[PDB]
Design a protein around this ligand. Structure first.
Ligand SMILES: CCCCCCCCCCCCCCCC(=O)O
Ligand SMILES: CCCCCCCCCCCCCCCC(=O)O
Lengths: 152, 152
């Protein structure tokens, strides 16, 4: 059959206002960024609940979490934006100020992909993030316990 | 300070067209459902790629995956929609036809939450889903391997 005509977004994805309300309430940290400076363009309630430091969308990510410039993150995002090669991480240990209580260590699982405009050029990136800090800490505590029982 | 006025969605979440584009391309299976019949209202490329059986949004989920009526799923969704109590699952083993190749077993991690309208009443639910079938099968194969090495 002939190649499919342009996507009918309303039918295939959902109406824009509905999709925004659902995105806002998806029970996972979701983030969309745009342009070569990785400006926040979409963030949901989960994101803002875990990291309430972001005011309105629009800022380059580096201005919100500058310490991550020492931890490969913006170099990584650049690569995705430039080459289109997606990336993921399992339990990446990162240190920055997430909620205004001070710099701290958190662990993250994530997947990041590029986003293309109609002509095929990359306009930004988006990610799912899982804050696994408490789960890593629980695993560590459980290991400490079995270590202690086995030693005594 | 006074209570905050109504959310400025454009500034807090993102512009509706932008947010829909980002939702569509989030590297995770995302699904929003509306009303007491759990009608699909938002689905992304990841969802449609893993389960290409859905045509346009709008159908009750039960019509697409009817077998799951034998596997607690619609009773679970009803509970979330009725009571507002969110639910999650780790490696739930479910059998239905996901891609038109026939009924098969898949394993899922998920989180499902309700979605409220302005007056506080629940208008639907939404979920993140992680298809963990291949990871469960890999774990099983690795266990079978250590079992066999230890037995010989
Ligand atoms: C924030 C820049 C995007 C880079 C994505 C790499 C994955 C690490 C996520 C760290 C960003 C801040 C974490 C936000 C939510 C949280 O602390 O759980
Ligand atoms: C399909 C709507 C019901 C949602 C209820 C529980 C979510 C876990 C079960 C997901 C079943 C559909 C899976 C589609 C994507 C895939 O097969 O990876």
């Amino acid at each position: 059959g002939a190649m499919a005509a342009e996507m009918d977004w309303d039918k295939t994805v959902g109406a824009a206002e509905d999709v925004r309300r659902i995105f806002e309430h998806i029970p996972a940290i979701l983030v969309g960024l745009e342009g070569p400076d990785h400006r926040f363009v979409a963030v949901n309630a989960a994101y803002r609940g875990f990291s309430p430091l972001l005011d309105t969308v629009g800022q380059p990510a580096r201005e919100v979490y500058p310490e991550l410039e020492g931890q490969q993150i913006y170099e990584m995002l650049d690569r995705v934006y430039q080459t289109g090669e997606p990336q993921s991480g399992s339990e990446w240990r990162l240190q920055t100020d997430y909620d205004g209580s001070g710099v701290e260590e958190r662990y993250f699982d994530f997947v990041v992909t590029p986003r293309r405009r109609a002509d095929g050029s990359i306009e930004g990136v988006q990610l799912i993030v899982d804050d696994v800090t408490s789960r890593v800490r629980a695993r560590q505590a459980a290991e400490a316990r079995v270590e202690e029982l086995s030693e005594r």
